[PDB]
Amino acid sequence: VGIRFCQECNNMLYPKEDKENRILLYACRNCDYQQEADNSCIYVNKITHEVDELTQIIADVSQDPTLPRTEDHPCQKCGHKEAVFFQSHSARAEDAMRLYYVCTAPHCGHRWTE
Amino acid sequence: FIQMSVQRIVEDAPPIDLQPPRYLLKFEQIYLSKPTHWERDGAPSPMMPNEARLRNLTYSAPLYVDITKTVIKEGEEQLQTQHQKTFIGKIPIMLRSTYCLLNGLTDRDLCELNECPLDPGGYFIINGSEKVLIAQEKMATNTVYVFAKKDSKYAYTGECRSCLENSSRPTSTIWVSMLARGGQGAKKSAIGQRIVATLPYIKQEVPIIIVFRALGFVSDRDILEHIIYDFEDPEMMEMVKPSLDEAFVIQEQNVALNFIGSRGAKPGVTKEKRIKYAKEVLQKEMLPHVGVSDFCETKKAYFLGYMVHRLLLAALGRRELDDRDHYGNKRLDLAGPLLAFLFRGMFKNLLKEVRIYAQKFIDRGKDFNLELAIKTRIISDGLKYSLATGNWGDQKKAHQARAGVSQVLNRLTFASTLSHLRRLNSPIGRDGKLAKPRQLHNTLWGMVCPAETPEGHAVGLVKNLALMAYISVGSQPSPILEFLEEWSMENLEEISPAAIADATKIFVNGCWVGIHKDPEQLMNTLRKLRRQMDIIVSEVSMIRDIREREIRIYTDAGRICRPLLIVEKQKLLLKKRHIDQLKEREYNNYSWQDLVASGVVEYIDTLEEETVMLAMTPDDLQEKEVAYCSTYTHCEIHPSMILGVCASIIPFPDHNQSPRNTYQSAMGKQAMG
Amino acid sequence: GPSSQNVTEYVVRVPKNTTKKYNIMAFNAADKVNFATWNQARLERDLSNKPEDQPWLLRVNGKSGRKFKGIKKGGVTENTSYYIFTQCPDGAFEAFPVHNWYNFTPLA
Amino acid sequence: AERGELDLTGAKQNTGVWLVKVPKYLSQQWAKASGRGEVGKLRIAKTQGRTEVSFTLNEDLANEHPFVLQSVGGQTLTVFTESSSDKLSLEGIVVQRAECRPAASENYMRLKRLQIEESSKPVRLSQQLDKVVTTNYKPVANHQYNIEYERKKKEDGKRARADKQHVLDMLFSAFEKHQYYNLKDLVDITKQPVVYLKEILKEIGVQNVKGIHKNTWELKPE
Ligand SMILES: [Zn+2]
Ligand SMILES: [Zn+2]
């Protein structure tokens, strides 16, 4: 799923097929450095696009003076009783009125939806 | 314009070395004298602004310069000589300025010259008439904007208009496109869209990997670290993969320069000229605001990478597109940045015709004399023409110029005079039916009057600015850069592109100038310096967006500001001690300036106004309760300062229907008094 | 150890003259070049530009044993001078000015 | 022994060098190096949990600078020399990089005075003149015209009206060295009138365009 760079000329390693041992070989097209593939899959295309933005929001958003705050929902990892919440603010806005939270305690940065 | 912007133009001009012997000429210092009128028999005398109106004169001041001339013939002696205070021309003078005859006079003397002590000033007197310059709007420069033309081949587009610090007549613009997905073809259906670029001074589109290699960086591990800042992202790397496939066969520097060098304003017949031609166009016309020297070409690579890294984020749907009419992307051209633009094209035109007079006169080998070379009618009649008639161009150029500037002052009633010296103008057409450049935008709060506008065909095209709105004048970014480097800011060259994922890119005036790893302490250190005015002047804006993880700083001229009240934890910073000593300015010498320099008010730009939380009134919004917010950062002075000049004479304007307030503001301008 | 328990003081001099100009020769760490493999080297200004501005051409272990091209940095003393500090037998330190910065890279 | 030959001794000795970044004002103090050119003394204190290096200015040079150690990783650095005898030498490899920084001795205003003192002359300003300076003088003969008049009086008189046959000695003389000469080259030899010179040129020769205008005369091939 990732990418492979050549170890000699630092370029993009293409996948190739050899008719001897039935194993995927990654080859270069400037030099001919070789090696075998460990996962033996090339292409993947996610159409659902249901990526949870809990992996994209940053912990320093709790320094924003223009975001609402809450005393109801406390943090689990530290027990702080003050959070700051917001919406998806991105694409995939068909049914996007969820409410992600971020703890505001210094050096906690814990994030969670509900 | 007349203390700095005119001295720099003659000082930063190429000498005219010319030739056997050869000669030198270079200009050093500029002087001016008070406006003067030459009588019929050649006896000068200072002209007062009143005679200029009665006798249909023109209110202008003569202009001098120091020129030094050295002859270089290696004739065992370098003979130099100088002619100081050489006459050049005459510049109009705006009334009540620091160079007028009415500067700093008292009412007993203003009445003695038959002048009104209430006259505001700020207009020219040209052939008896009274002309006023209208501030023109303009799209902001040196920033990246991402749009989406839903009619043409492109699925996304970026733009960056660049100009190297007030020194270029044109402004080179560069696009970074991306072709459409639904390209009907059984070939590219599989690979996908290819990122393209449309450089200036070339005919054909160019793939981006090619123009990357023309700067060096032929390897594809080094290119793909200027464009992608973290290699744990497979979704983005998949999108840049089909950009390499078409630039795969051309894999070295010199053949790349030939590829772009083959299609220019002149197709190269030989090879070395194309490799020469492609060298400077990619060096002096590509992103001149970053650096124009032939060195420091790693910076032109990073910025071109950031321009492309930002185009992909707009395709994965991770950041929203830019707004065209968002009033934080606009700049205003006052009389300063307008006369300076018109003075360049007439100083070059004055040097272009000292050569033509020197060569014709030095081939015969006689000698040289410069007092006869200077055609004085170039600058005098050049400015006076375009101001008097309006078309912002040249006399033989009455077809290529922008019209509508410099109209006649309105003197029907005293509030029709003030409402003329404070007026903007958006340069879009006067009959286009597109509503989005005409409707009222949220960002006009407090900086443009919402009610005052004319009807007819010019609805929403001309606008008047609010009462406390203040336009900035400009400064040099030198003293902030020297402070930033000593506050732990890593330069771009001496850093590894893997220490860039968790750092906040620091921009200054449009140019990427480093990174930083602890921004929140930098920010509230930059601010507490401006609050008390040690290193940074009060008209710079400093934006920080937490999410996109960067920091911007601006120092240029054209941004529009307005003062606000600074708020600490939940209380104002304006204590009573400031009031009982401010009601005594008459014999205490304590005024507005001593109020800014004490850190209780602050000018807030439009861009900076998106990272702020305002309260509208102290006694009512800053009380602890079950409250709306609790982190207020500023507070307004009085919410009645959001109205213009002609709309703030209406009693109880918050009780009328809205179109009614628009009619009167365009109707109190024609009331007799 | 002495890196934790070592204390010393040495004199520093900055001679107003030198018998040779001092430059920096920089290598990418990522290459991890074994200098021991450099039996010999040749070093000449690059010929593409057909002097002090000329990029260097380094030929190690023969004409094609090893070859690099060195490109001059934009600036070296634009804001702050760079000094070479060398230890002398008397323990005192000697400082040498850096004249230029050249960037050296490997060549297929 | 060759010009393009590089000494590898330093490298092969594994000679190490140190690299230190120094501010210009200090470096300007250093150009005034005391005595031979010693600028002071360096102090190095290493402990189990910390290491401190600093340099102190020569008392003479004066009339604490902590060091910030920098990484040299990612790029191998070596020092190479050019002697005053133009001999080339590699002194060593850089084993340390560092930066001299201020510490508890200044704030921004203090730093600023130094910047101002370095300007002395800033970018030029437009000054305000008093009244109006004289512009038009009363010269009688323009100076350029008088220089031309003198040259024309010193010339226009050496016309070699005689030498009816001797020129031809000098003209042929020149014509043997190059088959043809531009009328101007021939004039540079004969100061006599061009019309009369052309008659002398036409009498003993013919003018060819030679192909790029440039009136050029040559001896008849007969
Ligand atoms: Zn390879
Ligand atoms: Zn927490």
Curated annotation (Swiss-Prot), chain A:
Chain intervals annotated as zinc finger (TFIIS-type): 71-113
Keyword Membrane tagged: no
Zinc finger annotations (C4-type) as residue ranges: 6-31
Stored SUPFAM superfamilies: Zinc beta-ribbon
UniProt-listed InterPro entries: DNA-dir_RNA_pol-M_15_CS, Rpa12/Rpb9/Rpc10/TFS, Zn_ribbon_RPB9, Zn_ribbon_RPB9_C, Znf_TFIIS
GO molecular function, one term: DNA-directed RNA polymerase activity
SMART domains linked: RPOL9 (SM00661), ZnF_C2C2 (SM00440)
Positions annotated to bind Zn(2+) 2: C75, C78, C103, C108
Tagged with keyword Kinase: no
Keyword vocabulary terms for this entry: Acetylation, DNA-directed RNA polymerase, Metal-binding, Nucleus, Transcription, Zinc, Zinc-finger
Binding site for Zn(2+) 1: C6, C9, C28, C31
Location of the protein in the cell: Nucleus, Nucleolus
GO BP, sorted A to Z: maintenance of transcriptional fidelity during transcription elongation by RNA polymerase II; transcription by RNA polymerase II; transcription initiation at RNA polymerase II promoter; transcription-coupled nucleotide-excision repair
Gene Ontology annotations for the cellular component aspect, listed alphabetically: nucleolus; nucleus; RNA polymerase II, core complex
PANTHER family according to UniProt: DNA-DIRECTED RNA POLYMERASE (PTHR11239), DNA-DIRECTED RNA POLYMERASE II SUBUNIT RPB9 (PTHR11239:SF1)
Function recorded in the entry: DNA-dependent RNA polymerase catalyzes the transcription of DNA into RNA using the four ribonucleoside triphosphates as substrates. Component of RNA polymerase II which synthesizes mRNA precursors and many functional non-coding RNAs. Pol II is the central component of the basal RNA polymerase II transcription machinery. It is composed of mobile elements that move relative to each other. RPB9 is part of the upper jaw surrounding the central large cleft and thought to grab the incoming DNA template.
Subunit structure: Component of the RNA polymerase II (Pol II) complex consisting of 12 subunits.
Family: Belongs to the archaeal RpoM/eukaryotic RPA12/RPB9/RPC11 RNA polymerase family.
Protein name: DNA-directed RNA polymerase II subunit RPB9
Gene that specifies this protein: POLR2I
UniProtKB/Swiss-Prot annotation, chain C:
Compartments it resides in: Nucleus
Post-translational modifications reported in the UniProt record: Phosphorylated on Ser and other residues by TAF1 and casein kinase II-like kinases.
Induction remarks: Up-regulated in response to enterovirus 71 (EV71) infection.
Subunit structure: Heterodimer of an alpha and a beta subunit. Interacts with GTF2F2, CTDP1, TAF6/TAFII80 and URI1. Interacts with GTF2B (via C-terminus and preferentially via acetylated form); this interaction prevents binding of GTF2B to GTF2F2.
Role played: TFIIF is a general transcription initiation factor that binds to RNA polymerase II and helps to recruit it to the initiation complex in collaboration with TFIIB. It promotes transcription elongation.
Protein family (similarity comment): Belongs to the TFIIF alpha subunit family.
Protein name: General transcription factor IIF subunit 1
Origin species: Homo sapiens
Organism placement in taxonomy: Eukaryota, Metazoa, Chordata, Craniata, Vertebrata
Residue span relative to the full protein: 5 to 150 of 517
From Swiss-Prot, chain D:
GO annotations of cellular component type: microtubule cytoskeleton; nucleoplasm; nucleus; transcription factor TFIIF complex
InterPro entries: TFIIF_beta, TFIIF_beta_HTH, TFIIF_beta_N, TFIIF_interaction, WH-like_DNA-bd_sf, WH_DNA-bd_sf
UniProt keyword list: Acetylation, DNA-binding, Nucleus, Phosphoprotein, Transcription, Transcription regulation
Localisation per UniProt entry: Nucleus
UniProt keyword Transmembrane present: no
Family: Belongs to the TFIIF beta subunit family.
Function of the molecule: TFIIF is a general transcription initiation factor that binds to RNA polymerase II and helps to recruit it to the initiation complex in collaboration with TFIIB.
Name of this protein: General transcription factor IIF subunit 2
Organism listed in the record: Homo sapiens (Human)
